[PDB]
Amino acid sequence: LPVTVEKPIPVVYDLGNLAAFDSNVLDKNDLDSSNARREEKIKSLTRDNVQLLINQLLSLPMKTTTESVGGTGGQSSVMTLLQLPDPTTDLPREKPLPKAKAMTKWEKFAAKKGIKPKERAGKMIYDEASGEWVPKWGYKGANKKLDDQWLVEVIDPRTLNRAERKRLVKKNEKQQRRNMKN
Amino acid sequence: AKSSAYSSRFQTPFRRRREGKTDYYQRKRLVTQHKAKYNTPKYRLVVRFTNKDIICQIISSTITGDVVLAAAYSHELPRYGITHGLTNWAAAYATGLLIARRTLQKLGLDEEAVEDGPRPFKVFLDIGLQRTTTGARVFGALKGASDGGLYVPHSENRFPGWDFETEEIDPELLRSYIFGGHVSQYMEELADDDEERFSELFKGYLADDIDADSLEDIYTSAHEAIRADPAFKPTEKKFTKEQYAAESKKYRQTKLSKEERAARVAAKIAALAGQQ
Amino acid sequence: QNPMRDLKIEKLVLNISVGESGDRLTRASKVLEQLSGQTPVQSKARYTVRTFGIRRNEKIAVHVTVRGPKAEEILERGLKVKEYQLRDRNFSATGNFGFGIDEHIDLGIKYDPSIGIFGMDFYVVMNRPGARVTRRKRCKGTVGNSHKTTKEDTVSWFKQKYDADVLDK
Amino acid sequence: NARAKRALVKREAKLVENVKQALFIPGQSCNKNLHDIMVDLSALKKPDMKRFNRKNDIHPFEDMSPLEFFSEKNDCSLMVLMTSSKKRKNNMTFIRTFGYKIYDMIELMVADNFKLLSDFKKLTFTVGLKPMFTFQGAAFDTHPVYKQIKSLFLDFFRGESTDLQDVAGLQHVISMTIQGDFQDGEPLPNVLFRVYKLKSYKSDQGGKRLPRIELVEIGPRLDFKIGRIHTPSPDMVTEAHKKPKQKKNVELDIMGDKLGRIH
Amino acid sequence: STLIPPPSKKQKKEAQLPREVAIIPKDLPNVSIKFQALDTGDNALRVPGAISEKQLEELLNQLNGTSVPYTFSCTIKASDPYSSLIKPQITLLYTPRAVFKVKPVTRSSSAIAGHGSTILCSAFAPHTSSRMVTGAGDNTARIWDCDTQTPMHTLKGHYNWVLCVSWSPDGEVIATGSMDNTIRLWDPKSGQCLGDALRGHSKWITSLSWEPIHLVKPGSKPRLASSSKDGTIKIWDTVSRVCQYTMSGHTNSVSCVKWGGQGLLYSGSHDRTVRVWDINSQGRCINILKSHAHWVNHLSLSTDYALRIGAFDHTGKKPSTPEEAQKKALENYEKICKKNGNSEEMMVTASDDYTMFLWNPLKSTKPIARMTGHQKLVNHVAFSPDGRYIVSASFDNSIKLWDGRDGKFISTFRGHVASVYQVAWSSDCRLLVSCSKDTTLKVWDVRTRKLSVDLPGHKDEVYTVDWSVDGKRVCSGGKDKMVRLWTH
RNA sequence: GGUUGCGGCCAUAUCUACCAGAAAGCACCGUUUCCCGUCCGAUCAACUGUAGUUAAGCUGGUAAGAGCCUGACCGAGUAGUGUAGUGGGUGACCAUACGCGAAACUCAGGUGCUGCAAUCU
RNA sequence: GAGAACAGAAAUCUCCAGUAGAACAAAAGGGUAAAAGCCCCCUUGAUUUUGAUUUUCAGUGUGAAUACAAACCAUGAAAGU
């Protein structure tokens, strides 16, 4: 029913990982294995550790949104949640940092001649005859209009159009490897 | 004809899946909800239908296996004045409305949370193994605690009276199923035509002299009666537990001891080996 | 002792396997349409055979399944042409069974020279009450052995009514 | 064509890394009693936990190589092996890795004064919450064994990282103590490992705010004996401690407002 | 979307320090304290330790010897009610609670289908919140079973827009003002056109008010006040359904009407003028008010929320005898009537001269305060349910707050984006709903001067909101033809 | 004690072969107007608890069944290998030592326990 | 495996079963089963918006890419994904 508990050593808080560090003297025979009077020596220290922890936790600022129904990625307005600091204790990172960078031999050519990158706007070209849009590749692509239309105007020609793309598709695939090497 | 090598190789599934009762795959989403946003305790509203009974429970999530915050039964309804059609559409609303008023009372917002405080309450809904069909009476349980005030977030598609070609809901047809008017309609559909099946069905209403227009008055009267008293009086528990114990033990077949089966082993080779 | 566990009919399987797709296939559905009343269902070709001249996914057979007494109505009029007589094999070990005839017009049906002549596959499945436990979604279980069916119960039941015969044992 | 790709993206290295995966493995020398310690230890690591069905003859301080042959498959950085013997009884071998390469290991023999969760006066618990962490003793911070043990269970139990937290999730706490003080030369003592679930009390001297917290044992009551230790190379340590790296006279005010200080 | 600028690299290190347990340690200084009731009385000079208020409440409740819990306020410049003691003898300012809490509305029920037109007005029954009538752009009205969220008696009979409705404050009769000329009275249980429509206004109905419970004799139904756009005001009977008189006072259309507390009537009209009318002079004008420079919209009275409810509390328990109801409505009015031991009900006028005037029409013809500050015109002004705070709603997307005593400015509930249409109070005088031209509703703590929770959910503009007398549920009406019940 | 739901561990929980199972609760079973859904009220939906049935499910029991689990010095400190001696040996590999360090094999026993809530002679 | 006329080694239809010799986008130590397999239902994707890497001659409060995150979007009754 009293609340505030002192200790001989100022207990370090790490609130980011929700941590508590008593550094006081651990008496040996109080922690004897065959000692029946053990659990209270465990628990009374522990609940005095915990009570001090929440007092720092309740000494924090908190969030109060005013949103409502269908709060998609947030709290309710009746929720009021603890603004935490960063985990200061530096834990071992699992995996090394992934920096897989190269110049890819295009960017070099983009470096010399300053070809700026394009807008990346959209897939849809405008067609004439018909007046529709009918985007470039993905469905009824502007590429494969030649192989599907019904005449030629001067050995099949349409499979040649399939073949020359299979050069140029695989030329991506050939230029894929050499930048994967270097 | 199955080999003994296969008798070592097969993997037994979980008993709760070997019984046709629980999908863990569905339950798996109900454990790992977000959870990288926050640590907010997840509450599960479990609704089950056997024949002739309705079970609805708010169930927590516990490593011990679960803790149930509250329970509501269809046989609690004659305490509140419903005698027939215990498994209909309407009792599910009556069940759903019940448990919310009941659980608010033990919650006690009317009648640790520091820094405001009141904190309205949400439970998410267990489906169970029931098919998700619109107008089904399982979602009638969803309708009750919603009107009871439990914020189970949902949408209105599976509610009855949901139009297909347009995203419209009929509150007027919804009102009839809550008060069970379609039953009392089909009471009157069977009273005038084919009394012989109508002799069979509705016989308790024929026993109690209960007609169609009274049925709509039954529930609506009984609703605020639930809202008066949801407070879960449990049974008087006749024939206390040992009386239930020993009577079942008069029908309880036991294993045999090894000292008996050795006499049963020795009974064979004297009989089935020593020339009859 | 059968307090509930008598031996009613599950359903009649009506089936017509047409090796091709086309008017010979569609009329065979129209044969099933004017017979069963319901719309039948078409089995696709499972793989490529080509010895029948057929390839995969060819919508090969049409068939339809009728339950209830409505099945039993149709079930009699084939046995009419089958003259209330079925033979030995003609029976599963489970007790499920069937037969077939050509000339679908032998029972009811007018000739209709624009529809042609097909033959049908007749098949009847049998059950006792309680089979839902092997059929229901929740709490799906397995029927006990004494509750299961044999050929032996099936034959004794089948001679009994429909006035039927064993036709070589 | 594309389903597996997301799994490969889950196996990608990443700036903000995921919650690390624990892996529980029964070894060859396994019995019933060690098996049920696993399950009552699993409860804190729900959900991210996997088991086997097989006895697995792996001698970790003999050879480490099949462990990655598991770890690279199941994408589990943390691995737990089950082993009990005459010399090293009840040894629950713990492994931290680094990029499916063994960062370090630790032998942990368990004493026989243990309790399972059924042994406790049974209370509640909510599955999959972040606990709180209490380390009683300076020797966690100083001694290199216990620094590594502090380096272990912080990186074992904490689960999700957050900036924001509900009050309602704060149900339980994990307490770890070294068994009394010792000296460099006195034997490394055992691990006093207890777990409580909290209980609020409106205590009326903290006023409107502060409650009184009186714990109850929930367990599992456990005591670890230290065996031997494999350690990482210092070059590996630097790799496992690195920031992703991701302004003078320049300040943002409130409302953005990139300012320029003159001097 | 737009974002808050992030905390700094400097600021991230600041939060890492352990800090600031509010120990209130001993806490032993001792400073003297003076109590003061906020109506008139100052009562003495005592000095305890730095304590919580629950002790302080039980300190004051023995001083009078009550067994009545109070709200405490202090440091009044800047109005800041150990909680105060960290801010710096000390004068404590106390005031009753009317102990009840209404929980803030966060979620909703479903949206309710119904009539295929816009929604014009709505009102709860005072005796229960499960019943609530709505006024529609259709020719018909609608009563809702709010528990089931279903229609109860789709209510046919008018043939123009049902503009304004009201509930008889005992719980018997429903008025329905219509856009043609017509008023029909209604029964909630039967849903039947109770006799012929009350006919006799020549333009459309503007506002309907009831004669209050504590004035009607036991054994008699209350009468009705009617204000219509032709400038006529007719006091109808319900029993014989024949009006008693017209009054030809105002020149233009009459905006709004309220029945007074001391048997009076109050009429804002489009003549830039408010008249005071008396029933006991057989409908005769007694005082004329001339302050506004543009015409008057939505007058209100101090004790009207008591005058609206008619002898129900928030529990809504039904009284038995009409004399008991004559006591109870008198009781509830007297609890709000004589704050200063004085039957001085107060009136505030609102108009499009961006101005409100504070009135005590019985005591004088001079306005007390000239409320000022809005940029676009005010629309909707209502007192607090304890008759203590006056709120002001306007078209300048802002909701200002005023005193009820001297007309002193308090603050402004900024946060609305479009023009605020109307507001309504919670019963325990804490919360405040408001509908605006934008889709959302916004609920406001009067105590902390802040948005509690913004709630979206409609599809279009919102014309009508209303709060339930028990403090449980909230109905809403707008153009998008759906009814939405909002609750905690 | 039986039962029922939600479960935990997930074979001591299975599989196979028989038999038993008051009470209650399940189940099978009654139906096709509405809501819903099928080639088909078989399934799923709704309805009824009425007309019936414990026959299956299920719950126990039985079988030197199959499998499976624990304890033991069961191998066994064995195999193996660490380390230690200007050991022996043409090689391949073998005596002394002190460190780890196993299994198959044998014996002893088995055949789901448990969490929450509610209910039945 | 036991079955059903035409119908045969192979056409479709019933029952028993395969711990799966389901096809698993992969290749695998391993596992998904009311599936990551089969079928049906509903729908964009190359969206916007600012702190890290770049490149600019109207250095162009970014002008765009690119990196990140947030708002959104799709579906599901929902948990969620």
PDB file of C-alpha atoms in Angstrom, chain D residues 40-198:
ATOM      1  CA  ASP D  40       6.136 -24.627 -21.256  1.00  0.00           C
ATOM      2  CA  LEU D  41       9.027 -22.594 -22.606  1.00  0.00           C
ATOM      3  CA  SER D  42       7.296 -22.415 -25.987  1.00  0.00           C
ATOM      4  CA  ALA D  43       4.459 -20.335 -24.534  1.00  0.00           C
ATOM      5  CA  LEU D  44       6.551 -17.191 -24.454  1.00  0.00           C
ATOM      6  CA  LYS D  45       7.661 -17.733 -28.039  1.00  0.00           C
ATOM      7  CA  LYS D  46       4.202 -18.226 -29.463  1.00  0.00           C
ATOM      8  CA  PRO D  47       3.723 -17.750 -32.296  1.00  0.00           C
ATOM      9  CA  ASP D  48       7.189 -17.848 -33.893  1.00  0.00           C
ATOM     10  CA  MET D  49       8.296 -21.314 -32.911  1.00  0.00           C
ATOM     11  CA  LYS D  50       8.816 -24.600 -34.679  1.00  0.00           C
ATOM     12  CA  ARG D  51       9.449 -28.139 -33.466  1.00  0.00           C
ATOM     13  CA  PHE D  52      10.426 -31.488 -34.849  1.00  0.00           C
ATOM     14  CA  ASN D  53       9.208 -35.036 -34.456  1.00  0.00           C
ATOM     15  CA  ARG D  54      12.621 -36.616 -34.645  1.00  0.00           C
ATOM     16  CA  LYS D  55      15.629 -37.437 -32.504  1.00  0.00           C
ATOM     17  CA  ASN D  56      18.618 -35.640 -33.941  1.00  0.00           C
ATOM     18  CA  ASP D  57      22.140 -36.733 -33.019  1.00  0.00           C
ATOM     19  CA  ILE D  58      23.932 -33.411 -33.105  1.00  0.00           C
ATOM     20  CA  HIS D  59      26.942 -32.725 -30.920  1.00  0.00           C
ATOM     21  CA  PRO D  60      27.235 -28.954 -31.011  1.00  0.00           C
ATOM     22  CA  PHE D  61      30.602 -28.462 -29.420  1.00  0.00           C
ATOM     23  CA  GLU D  62      31.846 -31.237 -31.660  1.00  0.00           C
ATOM     24  CA  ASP D  63      30.482 -30.100 -35.012  1.00  0.00           C
ATOM     25  CA  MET D  64      28.224 -27.237 -36.012  1.00  0.00           C
ATOM     26  CA  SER D  65      27.595 -27.967 -39.669  1.00  0.00           C
ATOM     27  CA  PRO D  66      24.168 -29.718 -39.747  1.00  0.00           C
ATOM     28  CA  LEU D  67      22.740 -26.925 -37.602  1.00  0.00           C
ATOM     29  CA  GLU D  68      22.931 -24.485 -40.473  1.00  0.00           C
ATOM     30  CA  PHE D  69      21.649 -27.318 -42.673  1.00  0.00           C
ATOM     31  CA  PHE D  70      18.555 -26.954 -40.539  1.00  0.00           C
ATOM     32  CA  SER D  71      18.772 -23.219 -40.012  1.00  0.00           C
ATOM     33  CA  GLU D  72      19.119 -22.166 -43.616  1.00  0.00           C
ATOM     34  CA  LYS D  73      16.121 -24.314 -44.449  1.00  0.00           C
ATOM     35  CA  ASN D  74      13.747 -23.183 -41.762  1.00  0.00           C
ATOM     36  CA  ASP D  75      15.069 -19.576 -41.782  1.00  0.00           C
ATOM     37  CA  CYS D  76      15.496 -19.687 -38.025  1.00  0.00           C
ATOM     38  CA  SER D  77      18.274 -17.628 -36.502  1.00  0.00           C
ATOM     39  CA  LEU D  78      17.748 -19.090 -33.043  1.00  0.00           C
ATOM     40  CA  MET D  79      17.942 -22.817 -32.415  1.00  0.00           C
ATOM     41  CA  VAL D  80      17.364 -24.923 -29.325  1.00  0.00           C
ATOM     42  CA  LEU D  81      18.574 -28.492 -28.952  1.00  0.00           C
ATOM     43  CA  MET D  82      17.509 -31.073 -26.372  1.00  0.00           C
ATOM     44  CA  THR D  83      20.143 -33.194 -24.653  1.00  0.00           C
ATOM     45  CA  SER D  84      20.549 -34.939 -21.321  1.00  0.00           C
ATOM     46  CA  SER D  85      23.526 -37.048 -20.299  1.00  0.00           C
ATOM     47  CA  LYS D  86      25.494 -38.350 -17.351  1.00  0.00           C
ATOM     48  CA  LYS D  87      28.019 -35.514 -17.404  1.00  0.00           C
ATOM     49  CA  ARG D  88      25.874 -32.759 -18.918  1.00  0.00           C
ATOM     50  CA  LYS D  89      22.373 -33.525 -17.733  1.00  0.00           C
ATOM     51  CA  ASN D  90      19.371 -31.598 -19.092  1.00  0.00           C
ATOM     52  CA  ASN D  91      21.438 -29.481 -21.434  1.00  0.00           C
ATOM     53  CA  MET D  92      19.290 -27.200 -23.584  1.00  0.00           C
ATOM     54  CA  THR D  93      21.786 -26.009 -26.173  1.00  0.00           C
ATOM     55  CA  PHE D  94      21.115 -22.464 -27.350  1.00  0.00           C
ATOM     56  CA  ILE D  95      22.379 -21.056 -30.635  1.00  0.00           C
ATOM     57  CA  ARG D  96      22.519 -17.562 -32.034  1.00  0.00           C
ATOM     58  CA  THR D  97      23.555 -17.335 -35.665  1.00  0.00           C
ATOM     59  CA  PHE D  98      24.541 -14.671 -38.178  1.00  0.00           C
ATOM     60  CA  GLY D  99      23.416 -15.069 -41.771  1.00  0.00           C
ATOM     61  CA  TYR D 100      23.060 -18.840 -41.289  1.00  0.00           C
ATOM     62  CA  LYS D 101      26.530 -18.872 -39.774  1.00  0.00           C
ATOM     63  CA  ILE D 102      26.945 -19.744 -36.127  1.00  0.00           C
ATOM     64  CA  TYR D 103      27.411 -16.575 -34.139  1.00  0.00           C
ATOM     65  CA  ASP D 104      27.763 -18.297 -30.766  1.00  0.00           C
ATOM     66  CA  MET D 105      26.509 -21.133 -28.592  1.00  0.00           C
ATOM     67  CA  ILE D 106      25.903 -21.932 -24.944  1.00  0.00           C
ATOM     68  CA  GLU D 107      25.403 -25.135 -22.952  1.00  0.00           C
ATOM     69  CA  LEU D 108      22.645 -24.896 -20.319  1.00  0.00           C
ATOM     70  CA  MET D 109      22.219 -27.810 -17.930  1.00  0.00           C
ATOM     71  CA  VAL D 110      18.965 -27.569 -16.005  1.00  0.00           C
ATOM     72  CA  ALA D 111      18.584 -28.341 -12.305  1.00  0.00           C
ATOM     73  CA  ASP D 112      16.004 -30.761 -10.950  1.00  0.00           C
ATOM     74  CA  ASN D 113      14.053 -28.312  -8.762  1.00  0.00           C
ATOM     75  CA  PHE D 114      11.935 -27.338 -11.722  1.00  0.00           C
ATOM     76  CA  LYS D 115       8.213 -26.795 -11.955  1.00  0.00           C
ATOM     77  CA  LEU D 116       6.007 -27.142 -14.981  1.00  0.00           C
ATOM     78  CA  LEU D 117       3.028 -24.899 -15.500  1.00  0.00           C
ATOM     79  CA  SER D 118       0.560 -27.514 -14.280  1.00  0.00           C
ATOM     80  CA  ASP D 119       2.513 -27.454 -11.017  1.00  0.00           C
ATOM     81  CA  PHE D 120       1.406 -23.885 -10.459  1.00  0.00           C
ATOM     82  CA  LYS D 121      -1.732 -22.532  -8.919  1.00  0.00           C
ATOM     83  CA  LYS D 122      -3.193 -22.015 -12.315  1.00  0.00           C
ATOM     84  CA  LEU D 123      -3.669 -18.453 -13.475  1.00  0.00           C
ATOM     85  CA  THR D 124      -4.408 -16.843 -16.777  1.00  0.00           C
ATOM     86  CA  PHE D 125      -2.111 -15.595 -19.538  1.00  0.00           C
ATOM     87  CA  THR D 126      -2.643 -13.995 -22.920  1.00  0.00           C
ATOM     88  CA  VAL D 127      -0.835 -15.678 -25.781  1.00  0.00           C
ATOM     89  CA  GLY D 128       1.740 -13.656 -27.677  1.00  0.00           C
ATOM     90  CA  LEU D 129       2.426 -10.554 -25.651  1.00  0.00           C
ATOM     91  CA  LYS D 130       5.646  -8.741 -24.966  1.00  0.00           C
ATOM     92  CA  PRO D 131       6.910  -9.437 -21.436  1.00  0.00           C
ATOM     93  CA  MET D 132       8.937  -7.152 -19.272  1.00  0.00           C
ATOM     94  CA  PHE D 133      12.550  -7.722 -18.383  1.00  0.00           C
ATOM     95  CA  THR D 134      14.287  -7.606 -15.018  1.00  0.00           C
ATOM     96  CA  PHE D 135      17.952  -8.452 -14.458  1.00  0.00           C
ATOM     97  CA  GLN D 136      18.966  -8.492 -10.800  1.00  0.00           C
ATOM     98  CA  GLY D 137      22.709  -8.258 -10.354  1.00  0.00           C
ATOM     99  CA  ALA D 138      25.590  -6.229 -11.702  1.00  0.00           C
ATOM    100  CA  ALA D 139      27.244  -9.389 -13.014  1.00  0.00           C
ATOM    101  CA  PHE D 140      24.876  -9.419 -15.976  1.00  0.00           C
ATOM    102  CA  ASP D 141      26.548  -6.218 -17.108  1.00  0.00           C
ATOM    103  CA  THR D 142      30.122  -7.094 -16.221  1.00  0.00           C
ATOM    104  CA  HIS D 143      30.854 -10.765 -16.504  1.00  0.00           C
ATOM    105  CA  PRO D 144      31.287 -11.977 -20.094  1.00  0.00           C
ATOM    106  CA  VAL D 145      29.259 -15.135 -19.618  1.00  0.00           C
ATOM    107  CA  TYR D 146      26.301 -13.254 -18.235  1.00  0.00           C
ATOM    108  CA  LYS D 147      26.732 -10.449 -20.724  1.00  0.00           C
ATOM    109  CA  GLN D 148      26.172 -13.104 -23.341  1.00  0.00           C
ATOM    110  CA  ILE D 149      23.161 -14.424 -21.432  1.00  0.00           C
ATOM    111  CA  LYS D 150      21.821 -10.896 -21.237  1.00  0.00           C
ATOM    112  CA  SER D 151      22.675 -10.830 -24.943  1.00  0.00           C
ATOM    113  CA  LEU D 152      20.593 -13.966 -25.358  1.00  0.00           C
ATOM    114  CA  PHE D 153      17.190 -13.575 -23.832  1.00  0.00           C
ATOM    115  CA  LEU D 154      16.770  -9.964 -24.764  1.00  0.00           C
ATOM    116  CA  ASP D 155      17.223 -11.171 -28.303  1.00  0.00           C
ATOM    117  CA  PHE D 156      15.047 -14.173 -27.592  1.00  0.00           C
ATOM    118  CA  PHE D 157      11.867 -13.038 -25.919  1.00  0.00           C
ATOM    119  CA  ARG D 158      11.185  -9.447 -26.904  1.00  0.00           C
ATOM    120  CA  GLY D 159       9.356 -10.242 -30.130  1.00  0.00           C
ATOM    121  CA  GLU D 160       8.062  -7.088 -31.733  1.00  0.00           C
ATOM    122  CA  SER D 161       9.786  -3.750 -31.658  1.00  0.00           C
ATOM    123  CA  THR D 162       7.497  -0.770 -31.264  1.00  0.00           C
ATOM    124  CA  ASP D 163       7.269   2.884 -30.488  1.00  0.00           C
ATOM    125  CA  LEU D 164       3.800   2.564 -29.103  1.00  0.00           C
ATOM    126  CA  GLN D 165       2.155   0.328 -26.566  1.00  0.00           C
ATOM    127  CA  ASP D 166      -1.129  -0.321 -24.851  1.00  0.00           C
ATOM    128  CA  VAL D 167      -1.359  -0.567 -21.085  1.00  0.00           C
ATOM    129  CA  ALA D 168      -3.462  -3.709 -21.407  1.00  0.00           C
ATOM    130  CA  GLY D 169      -0.677  -5.807 -22.885  1.00  0.00           C
ATOM    131  CA  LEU D 170       1.489  -5.489 -19.789  1.00  0.00           C
ATOM    132  CA  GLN D 171       0.479  -8.727 -18.140  1.00  0.00           C
ATOM    133  CA  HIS D 172       3.614 -10.629 -17.228  1.00  0.00           C
ATOM    134  CA  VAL D 173       7.294 -10.236 -16.492  1.00  0.00           C
ATOM    135  CA  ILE D 174      10.395 -12.380 -16.746  1.00  0.00           C
ATOM    136  CA  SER D 175      12.857 -12.393 -13.861  1.00  0.00           C
ATOM    137  CA  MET D 176      16.406 -13.665 -14.203  1.00  0.00           C
ATOM    138  CA  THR D 177      18.940 -13.658 -11.397  1.00  0.00           C
ATOM    139  CA  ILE D 178      22.365 -15.194 -10.974  1.00  0.00           C
ATOM    140  CA  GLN D 179      22.353 -17.504  -7.951  1.00  0.00           C
ATOM    141  CA  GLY D 180      24.006 -15.263  -5.415  1.00  0.00           C
ATOM    142  CA  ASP D 181      27.191 -13.366  -5.843  1.00  0.00           C
ATOM    143  CA  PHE D 182      30.392 -15.110  -6.854  1.00  0.00           C
ATOM    144  CA  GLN D 183      33.976 -14.308  -7.707  1.00  0.00           C
ATOM    145  CA  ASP D 184      36.186 -14.856 -10.712  1.00  0.00           C
ATOM    146  CA  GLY D 185      37.569 -18.069  -9.311  1.00  0.00           C
ATOM    147  CA  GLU D 186      34.419 -19.055  -7.502  1.00  0.00           C
ATOM    148  CA  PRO D 187      32.293 -21.278  -9.763  1.00  0.00           C
ATOM    149  CA  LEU D 188      29.767 -19.675 -12.089  1.00  0.00           C
ATOM    150  CA  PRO D 189      26.486 -19.962 -10.185  1.00  0.00           C
ATOM    151  CA  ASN D 190      23.173 -21.147 -11.419  1.00  0.00           C
ATOM    152  CA  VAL D 191      20.476 -19.118 -13.141  1.00  0.00           C
ATOM    153  CA  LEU D 192      17.536 -18.074 -10.992  1.00  0.00           C
ATOM    154  CA  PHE D 193      14.790 -17.881 -13.586  1.00  0.00           C
ATOM    155  CA  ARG D 194      11.269 -16.907 -12.543  1.00  0.00           C
ATOM    156  CA  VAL D 195       8.210 -15.545 -14.328  1.00  0.00           C
ATOM    157  CA  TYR D 196       5.316 -13.642 -12.797  1.00  0.00           C
ATOM    158  CA  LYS D 197       1.998 -12.281 -13.937  1.00  0.00           C
ATOM    159  CA  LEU D 198       1.092  -8.872 -12.614  1.00  0.00           C
TER     160      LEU D 198
END
